[PDB]
Design a protein around this ligand. Structure first.
Ligand SMILES: [Cl-]
Ligand SMILES: [Cl-]
Length: 164
């Protein structure tokens, strides 16, 4: 299992614009287009992202291209973030994938805000961080996804993803 497979499970693959769980226009594998309520705005962002007049539909290859760029961006945001970097640097390979997941999902900024859990993760207090992570809007809004990631941090294994 790896980050790509992991996030592909968490986000699915959609070839036409759709609204995510927060009501925002997205496409591909979790690629947020815009927070704005305008389908046009969304369409404009997509064409600009793809480099062609798409008409709100993309190919699988195109979706994957955005997916690679996005994963890459998440890794670099972490590495560039003064609050994130040290946490990431202290984790094993599986847990690093759990940190990338959250960043992909809610941005560096959102993640850097879980100050307390970050501290626990850094200290390797797994069960305690797991409990703390759960006390969040994130967990309450998308509990199933949140549980997979949280279990990943608790255990340091891919068990939550095997079966999916
Ligand atoms: Cl883009
Ligand atoms: Cl969920």
């Amino acid at each position: 299992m790896n980050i790509f497979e992991m996030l592909r499970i968490d986000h699915g693959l959609r070839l036409k614009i759709y609204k995510d769980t927060e009501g925002y226009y997205t496409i591909g594998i979790g690629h947020l287009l815009t927070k704005s309520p305008s389908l046009n705005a969304a369409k404009s962002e997509l064409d600009k992202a793809i480099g062609r007049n798409t008409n709100g539909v993309i190919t699988k290859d195109e979706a994957e291209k955005l997916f690679n760029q996005d994963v890459d961006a998440a890794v670099r945001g972490i590495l560039r973030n003064a609050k994130l970097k040290p946490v990431y640097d202290s984790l094993d390979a599986v847990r690093r994938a759990a940190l990338i997941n959250m960043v992909f999902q809610m941005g560096e900024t959102g993640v850097a805000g879980f100050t307390n859990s970050l501290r626990m993760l850094q200290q390797k207090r797994w069960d305690e961080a797991a409990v703390n992570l759960a006390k969040s809007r994130w967990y309450n809004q998308t509990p199933n996804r949140a549980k997979r990631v949280i279990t990943t941090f608790r255990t340091g294994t891919w068990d939550a993803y095997k079966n999916l």
